[PDB]
Amino acid sequence: MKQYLELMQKVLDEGTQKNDRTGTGTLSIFGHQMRFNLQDGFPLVTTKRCHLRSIIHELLWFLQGDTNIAYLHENNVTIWDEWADENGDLGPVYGKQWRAWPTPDGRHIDQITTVLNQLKNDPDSRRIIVSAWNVGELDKMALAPCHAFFQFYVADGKLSCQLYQRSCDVFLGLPFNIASYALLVHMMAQQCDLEVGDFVWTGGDTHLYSNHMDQTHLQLSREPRPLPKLIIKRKPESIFDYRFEDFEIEGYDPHPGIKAPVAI
């Protein structure tokens, strides 16, 4: 997609060479933002075949407030298998924080339920936020949240979302991250009888791994195509009741997938 290709080029032209955690090396930029009007179709990359199924199960895994990669296993998403313990556990990652942030004093705060309620009774709120950055528990997580904090906003019957992403693998992670969030807006929008607005993406350390150069270049030379369109075949009784079968994508005609090694 234009915005995506443009950020990829910007990493190449201006990125600084950094030595990372995995000792792989990256080209890196700090601070970037991109806007997606959901009115113009689903931001699913067309410059590489992307698979909506991986995207969809991860999201629903989150809404369930799950942190065990089993569910993801029985659906063939394996990205997280390298991070779980022998029990298949990841610690209190995304899902746990989203559905049950533990108060210092015993309780759990359901951030999705709060946000649904705000969206329904106080759309003007400037405090409609979800945070996965639980300082108190970062030590227990297999990996610290990448997609750390997001905020919803309503203006003229449209639901907008901004995500703050502290760390981003432009080639591999970015395309999933974008689609996942785009998808949540749509689900939230339907449960709240609102129309879709903008999906705003802001990143922290935005990088291309030193061994994605060849893949990048190739991608950079493909022509973005018209964005597909999302279809929700039924209005579940709640945000927690979606199923993989409920979603469909029209007009998806991408460029073949491109293979690249994950830096672990």
Ligand X SMILES: Cc1nc2ccc3ccc(CNc4ccc5c(c4)CN([C@@H](CCC(=O)O)C(=O)O)C5=O)cc3c2c(=O)[nH]1
List contacts with ligand UMP (CB under 6 A). Answer: 21, 126-127, 143-144, 146-147, 167-169, 173, 177
DSSP 108: E
Pair 62, 98: CB distance under 8 Å? yes
Pair 88, 69: CB distance under 8 Å? yes
Query: Which one, 159 or 179, has the nearer CB to ligand UMP?
Result: 179
Q: Which residue has the tokens 């469909």?
A: 248
Q: What tokens does 24 get? A: 């792989």
User: Measured between alpha carbons, how far is 42 from 184 in angstroms, rounded to an integer?
Assistant: 12
- Residue 219, C-beta contacts closer than 8 angstroms, at least 6 positions apart: 5, 8, 47, 48, 171, 258
Candidate list 52, 55, 183, 185; residue touching ligand X; CB under 6 A = 55
Q: How many residues bind ligand X (CB under 6 A)?
A: 15
Candidate list 2, 19, 237, 256; residue touching a second copy; CB under 8 A = 19
Q: Which residue has the tokens 């689609």?
A: 179
Give which of 142, 151, 149, 150 is closest to 93, Cα–Cα: 142
Query: Which one, 88 or 173, has the nearer CB to ligand UMP?
Result: 173
Residue ranges of the annotated binding site are 21, 51, 126-127, 166-169, 177, 207-209, 263
Residues in the annotated binding site for dUMP:
21, 126-127, 166-169, 177, 207-209
Give me the residues that bind a second copy (CB under 8 A), please. 16, 18-21, 28, 30-33, 35, 101-105, 107, 109, 111, 124-127, 129, 131, 133-137, 144, 148-149, 151, 153, 155-156, 160, 162, 164, 166-167, 197-198, 200, 202, 204-205
